[PDB]
């Protein structure tokens, strides 16, 4: 068990979460455009 | 305290967060369908 | 530095993130009700 | 590898995720205002 690897694994997991939330942000931007042009 | 267990616990916590965000994504897809057919 | 404390701190941080995402989920449920009755 | 640094790095990563989710919350508040005045 290399603590350094553990740190790299955790950072990789946090990066994945970040990207997921970012795609959720884009879906909300998408919705807001849908409404902004229709309404 | 087994560092390996600590790593498995952290990975399990990150997996749970991922699934939670995924369900939030599905709720937004749901909303976007609601509006897309009504509007 | 007690690895056990480190684990409890991390779990507490993940719990806080979970609750935050949960409140975001509730805001989306709120929006979906707003639209579902108006539309 | 200083376990303390590892802890500070993890806390910094969790803080970044928190702020990201917070900005997503603000985008949803923004959308809800858009609809609340138009509808
Ligand atoms: Cu984490």
Residue numbers in the entry:
A (entry chain A), B (entry chain A), C (entry chain A), D (entry chain A): 376 to 414
Sentences from the paper on this structure:
To characterize structurally the C-terminal coiled-coil region in KCa3.1 (KCa3.1-CC), we determined its crystal structure at 1.75-Å resolution. The structure reveals a parallel four-helix bundle, consistent with the tetrameric nature of the channel. The space group of the tetragonal crystals is P4212, and the asymmetric unit comprises two KCa3.1-CC molecules. In the structure of copper-containing KCa3.1-CC, the crystallographic four-fold axis generates two parallel four-helix bundles comprising four (identical) copies of each of the two KCa3.1-CC protomers in the asymmetric unit. The packing within the crystal is diagrammed in S1 Fig. The root-mean-square deviation (rmsd) of Cα atoms (residues 378–411) for the two copies of KCa3.1-CC in the asymmetric unit is 0.49 Å. As expected, based on coiled-coil prediction software, His389 occupies an inward-facing ‘a’ position in the heptad repeat of the coiled-coil/four-helix bundle. In the copper-containing structure, a copper ion is positioned on the four-fold axis, ligated by the NE2 nitrogen atom (also known as N3) of the imidazole ring from each of the four copies of His389, with an N3-Cu distance of 2.1 Å. An axial water molecule, at 2.5 Å on the N-terminal side, completes the square-pyramidal coordination. Based on the coordination geometry, the copper ion is Cu(II). In the partially refined apo structure, the side chain of His389 points away from the center of the four-helix bundle (data not shown).
KCa2.1, KCa2.2, KCa2.3, and KCa3.1, also known as SK1–4 (or SK1–3 and IK1), are small- (KCa2.1–2.3) or intermediate-conductance (KCa3.1) potassium channels encoded by the KCNN genes. These homotetrameric potassium channels constitutively bind the calcium-binding protein calmodulin (CaM) in their cytoplasmic regions, and calcium binding to channel-associated CaM is thought to induce a conformational change that leads to channel opening. By effluxing potassium ions, KCa3.1 maintains a negative membrane potential necessary for sustained calcium influx via calcium release-activated channels (CRACs) and for subsequent cytokine production. The cytoplasmic domain contains a CaM-binding region followed by a predicted coiled-coil region near the C-terminus, which is important for proper processing and trafficking of the channel.
